[PDB]
Amino acid sequence: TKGTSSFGKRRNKTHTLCRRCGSKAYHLQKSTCGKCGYPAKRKRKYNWSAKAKRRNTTGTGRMRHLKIVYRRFRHGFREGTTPKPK
Amino acid sequence: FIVDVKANKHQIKQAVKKLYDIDVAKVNTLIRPDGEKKAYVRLAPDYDALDVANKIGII
Amino acid sequence: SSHKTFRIKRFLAKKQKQNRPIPQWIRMKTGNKIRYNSKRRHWRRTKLGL
């Protein structure tokens, strides 16, 4: 039918892991992500889902580089001068 | 042996040959479920797999 | 499947490494709160991607 008798035919996967967002949104039959949009050059961000800008903007990650700009700035971007040796 | 993930069978031969000053006939490398590339190093007939075993520490 | 891609086999490797229970000695740390692992899953009650 269309109830439980039709749920057995579900043995295909339209989506799969994306390569940029990391989520499961990479629509296979047409090659375009859902959560970020992969082949395009612009991260998909919309203002109608404010709880979707909170999940993956700046802060939620590890910040391998934006963390040490903040440490660097407090002193003024010092360069090449080791502290006075002993 | 257990070998880094990105390592050819051509590369494992050189490492063991240069490490223990030994000879290798052929190598077989599966990759375990955990993600470590297990490697089976068939030893050359000129050498005794026990006598090399004692050197590298394993009983 | 026994035709799994390399990437999938790698992803199904982390999901095995982190299925273990907590080490016993964790509970005795001075500031310690956890008392049994929570993320732990059983392959009949969770479907890996959902």
Added chain:
Amino acid sequence: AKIKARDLRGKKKEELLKQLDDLKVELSQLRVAKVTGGAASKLSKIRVVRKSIARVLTVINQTQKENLRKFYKGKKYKPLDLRPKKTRAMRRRLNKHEESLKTKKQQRKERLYPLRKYAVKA
């Protein structure tokens, strides 16, 4: 045991590699001791060695770049490493003595009508 970084700064770059490969064999040996039994004596020691290789490698990488950064000083085209990395903007925006220039017209006016102190009784 313990190897300071205050005796490694001067040894030859062909002498360090001798000790660097010595440890990597010593670390290789200990890793066996973990798998095939061993005791708590050797297991804790792996952390002592694994940081020694950090000490020796860093000293090499430092004397390799300090020498190079002496080689490229006084030159005008130096590789992308040895140039400062400040930000995106503090390289394209600022300038040494290029955005401190005054035209002839601007120079002569400041030269001719200089600003000078005064004060007024009430």
Added chain:
RNA sequence: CGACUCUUAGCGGUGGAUCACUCGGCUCGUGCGUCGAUGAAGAACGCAGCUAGCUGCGAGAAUUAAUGUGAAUUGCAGGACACAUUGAUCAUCGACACUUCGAACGCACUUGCGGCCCCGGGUUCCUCCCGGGGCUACGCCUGUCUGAGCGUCGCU
């Protein structure tokens, strides 16, 4: 009335309200007001003696070096240190590293296929097979080199 039921009280259970706490939030103000092709934001994978996440970090991976302090970390074993000395632990971090995906950059998205130059095996010039090293994106500016035209001319 022994039972059953009802009402109240003592006690014991199911339950977590009230009360007091609080390394948490909301709101207001001040100072500063800084990301990225030298590779950002985000994502995957890894790393501890025992360790799953949480945090921290990147094959130098629960950190290296330097400075300041000055005798610990600790859940258990181990030993580092003559604490005597660069000298345990922590804070700062200016030096030194920084895997793979990502604007993502040889073509692709399957650890797939390549080219061009250097080094070591493979050679001993004898071409290959192996490993290591450096490049191989689009648009755009100035300059260089090579060029195309029954475009405009000059000359022999």
Added chain:
RNA sequence: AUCCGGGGGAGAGGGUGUAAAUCUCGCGCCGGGCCGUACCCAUAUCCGCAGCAGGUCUCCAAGGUGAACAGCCUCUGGCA
């Protein structure tokens, strides 16, 4: 994709003991990275909120009666 046969004759080869060629004729040497590889495959390991009478693609296919892979009984194999 790849592999092959045919036509045509630009070229090569030596001047009398030897060549150039074998759409390798018989031998001989060296090399063949990278990733998947267990198991279930279903009235229990999949989808239906589960050890759900539902659903989901194929290969193998004995003896007897019988037109027959029908129905029914038995052997290899399996089950409570």
Added chain:
RNA sequence: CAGAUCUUGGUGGUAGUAGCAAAUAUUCAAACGAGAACUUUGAAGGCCGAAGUGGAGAAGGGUUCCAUGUGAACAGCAGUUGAACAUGGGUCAGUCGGUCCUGAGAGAUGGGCGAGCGCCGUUCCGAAGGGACGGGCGAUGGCCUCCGUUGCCCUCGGCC
């Protein structure tokens, strides 16, 4: 605060009640064991009866696979068993597949459109071939004999 078929949390009567009835079927003895209608062995009686209640695969699951052990919890009774729980172990390729090829289709530069992220389009308004035999010269290399090799040019090549 008594109410809003009020929100969240909790507990009753119903109630030890409905129920544990789809596909013929179990019995005797023995073993470990504290314990046995259910676990294991043996004997018997039955069924699935090769379009299977059999022997393997693809999708899909992702360690359920195998061994040792456990008696909290789950397996709508139980259980000495498990698909559970705790430790260990396991997946080896020139020749089996992937990779290579094109199929319906998808898609970028050229071009066109568009306020704009981009869009239409696939030979279509494009200087789209970076390769080769030989030849002339310069020029190394190694027995600069001879050939491997290199730069300029002459030639050759449909861009489909």
Added chain:
RNA sequence: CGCGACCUCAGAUCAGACGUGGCGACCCGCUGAAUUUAAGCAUAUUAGUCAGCGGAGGAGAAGAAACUAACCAGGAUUCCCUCAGUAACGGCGAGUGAACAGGGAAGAGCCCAGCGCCGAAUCCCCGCCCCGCGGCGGGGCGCGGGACAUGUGGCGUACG
């Protein structure tokens, strides 16, 4: 039917550069609805608002009148109070709705092209050597390259 200028126009893994993306609380440029109100409803209102697209900065934008005035006249921009919920718009319904003048915060001014004069007096880059140099600058040395007459640099711009 060769040689040499210039003009248009390509290819370079040519030397040296730069953009791509992220954040978006504040800002700038486009695009731009419907619930709602009118006791219905279409103009109107909600409103040039939310949603969409682009682009930066620690601030953006604006800015030294092709101005306001009509006075005995003020004097770039922005911001506060006031003018004012007024003038004006509106199925003149619902509703919408500024500005000049005043006092304050701050106060900063200017540069070109053209007209023309100066022997392109102008400029980018290579190479050499001397100095500094972790915002690549200065000293000179070059019968070293190129741009530039289809116009660079100084004087000079409505206050002349």
